[PDB]
Amino acid sequence: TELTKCKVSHAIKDIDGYQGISLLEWACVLFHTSGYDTQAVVNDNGSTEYGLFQISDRFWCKSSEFPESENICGISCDKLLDDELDDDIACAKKILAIKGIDYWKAYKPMCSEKLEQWRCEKP
Amino acid sequence: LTACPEESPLLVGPMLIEFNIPVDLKLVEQQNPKVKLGGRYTPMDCISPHKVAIIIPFRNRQEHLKYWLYYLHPILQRQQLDYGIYVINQAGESMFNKAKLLNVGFKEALKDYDYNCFVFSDVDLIPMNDHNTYRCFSQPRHISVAMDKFGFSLPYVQYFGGVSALSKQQFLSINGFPNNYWGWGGEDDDIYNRLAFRGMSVSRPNAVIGKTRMIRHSRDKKNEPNPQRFDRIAHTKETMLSDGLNSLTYMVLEVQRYPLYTKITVDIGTPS
Numbered sequence: 001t002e003l004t005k006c007k008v009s010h011a012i013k014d015i016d017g018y019q020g021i022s023l024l025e026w027a028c029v030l031f032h033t034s035g036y037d038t039q040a041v042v043n044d045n046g047s048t049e050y051g052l053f054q055i056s057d058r059f060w061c062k063s064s065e066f067p068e069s070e071n072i073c074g075i076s077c078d079k080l081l082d083d084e085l086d087d088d089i090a091c092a093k094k095i096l097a098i099k100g101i102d103y104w105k106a107y108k109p110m111c112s113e114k115l116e117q118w119r120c121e122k123p
Numbered sequence: 124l125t126a127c128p129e130e131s132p133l134l135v136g137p138m139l140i141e142f143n144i145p146v147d148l149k150l151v152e153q154q155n156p157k158v159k160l161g162g163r164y165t166p167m168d169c170i171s172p173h174k175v176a177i178i179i180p181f182r183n184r185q186e187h188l189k190y191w192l193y194y195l196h197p198i199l200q201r202q203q204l205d206y207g208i209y210v211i212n213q214a215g216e217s218m219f220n221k222a223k224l225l226n227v228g229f230k231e232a233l234k235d236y237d238y239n240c241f242v243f244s245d246v247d248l249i250p251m252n253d254h255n256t257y258r259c260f261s262q263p264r265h266i267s268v269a270m271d272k273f274g275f276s277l278p279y280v281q282y283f284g285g286v287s288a289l290s291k292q293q294f295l296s297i298n299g300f301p302n303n304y305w306g307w308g309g310e311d312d313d314i315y316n317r318l319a320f321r322g323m324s325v326s327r328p329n330a331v332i333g334k335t336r337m338i339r340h341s342r343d344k345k346n347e348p349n350p351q352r353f354d355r356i357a358h359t360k361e362t363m364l365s366d367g368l369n370s371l372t373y374m375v376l377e378v379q380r381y382p383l384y385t386k387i388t389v390d391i392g393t394p395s
């Protein structure tokens with residue numbers, strides 16, 4: 001489902017400030033990463049990335065294509081293709097804690113300035 | 124005859140844009156008698172200072188083109204533009220390269236006429252208000268500002284995708300567009316970065332005037348999201364000097380002049 005900036009911001013409130021990344025920065029990162037599409041599936045040189053956060057089956061989730069994945073998040077990649085974001089968020093936090101924000105390549109080029117446009121004013 | 128008025132008196136404002144009824148290009152031609160071979164039109168009424176080449180990147184989108192021509196030809200004439208339509212068709216079946224095709228269109232359109240403005244448009248975007256003029260402004264122009272697929276609102280302030288227009292000088296200023304973005308995404312952000320580095324800002328009509336519809340469609344094979352896009356966008360300042368108009372190479376396989384447009388088929392190589 002293609003979510004809205006505010007639907008996403010509200011769903012990921014928990015993540016705000018975690019590892020030093022604000023909600024404003026996440027709203028920006030997620031828009032460029034998946035277009036807020038919880039069903040996004042994209043290939044990246046030999047592996048596949050899933051959902052809103054584009055979590056990869058290379059190290060983070062287990063897909064059928066790569067059963068032997070490290071599966072650090074301990075989850076089937078299909079759990080990252082629905083509209084329930086709690087597990088997606090928990091996995092993203094592990095990536096943030098372990099690898100860091102650099103995992104999300106869009107952050108630096110697209111979310112280093114003009115962050116105010118990403119604010120959600122919906123109470 | 125004298126100069127066309129600053130704003131055309133022929134404008135109707137908001138239009139109902141739909142893709143339900145089949146389009147017959149034969150009808151379209153009939154409905155647009157003033158358009159000449161190659162999809163060229165010049166006001167017979169006044170003299171337009173806007174010499175516009177409209178460039179459409181293309182491959183296997185004829186059905187979308189039909190709708191584009193059906194809607195745009197009447198609109199562009201009402202806007203009193205001296206224009207020409209150029210569809211740059213990528214030959215072959217390797218990775219699509221939107222921006223490189225747009226550079227090809229710039230160079231090829233210039234062989235036909237002394238154009239001073241270039242509109243770069245996806246084949247599936249139709250403006251919903253004819254006050255959203257398809258011409259160049261004092262700063263690079265972002266035209267498709269409120270797309271129906273984005274809920275009629277700009278996705279982000281630095282967004283320059285869809286339909287844009289650069290004067291001949293603005294385009295030359297940034298060494299044109301990059302030729303190194305293969306596959307979907309990022310090339311428009313690189314272009315935004317180039318304009319910004321040359322000290323320009325983006326001009327845009329407001330969201331009401333800029334409403335635009337995109338014909339609904341699935342993703343094209345061979346235009347999958349580019350894995351290198353984010354890394355490339357981060358380095359525009361250094362690569363724009365060596366990747367662009369000055370480094371463009373391609374081969375022309377066919378030039379077709381149809382009554383509604385010129386379609387140039389080209390071989391632009393493969394990812395290197």
Ligand SMILES: O=c1ccn([C@@H]2O[C@H](COP(=O)(O)OP(=O)(O)O[C@H]3O[C@H](CO)[C@H](O)[C@H](O)[C@H]3O)[C@@H](O)[C@H]2O)c(=O)[nH]1
Binds near residue numbers: 244342
């Ligand atoms: O097989 C293809 C692929 C692309 N195109 C041309 O390339 C344009 C853009 O491709 P898509 O329509 O599939 O892209 P998006 O709808 O997802 O459009 C947006 O993302 C692109 C990202 O590369 C550009 O920035 C484009 O200007 C912007 O509107 C098309 O409209 C069309 O003019 C073809 O003709 N055939």
Ligand SMILES: O=c1ccn([C@@H]2O[C@H](COP(=O)(O)OP(=O)(O)O)[C@@H](O)[C@H]2O)c(=O)[nH]1
Binds near residue numbers: 149152185381382383
């Ligand atoms: O201004 C135009 C452009 C195209 N066509 C028609 O559209 C067809 C298809 O053109 P395309 O390049 O898609 O097909 P090709 O000619 O290369 O088979 C033409 O043959 C014509 O019958 C037309 O009638 N008027």
Ligand SMILES: [Ca+2]
Binds near residue numbers: 084085086
């Ligand atoms: Ca989930």
Ligand SMILES: [Mn+2]
Binds near residue numbers: 245337
């Ligand atoms: Mn499209």
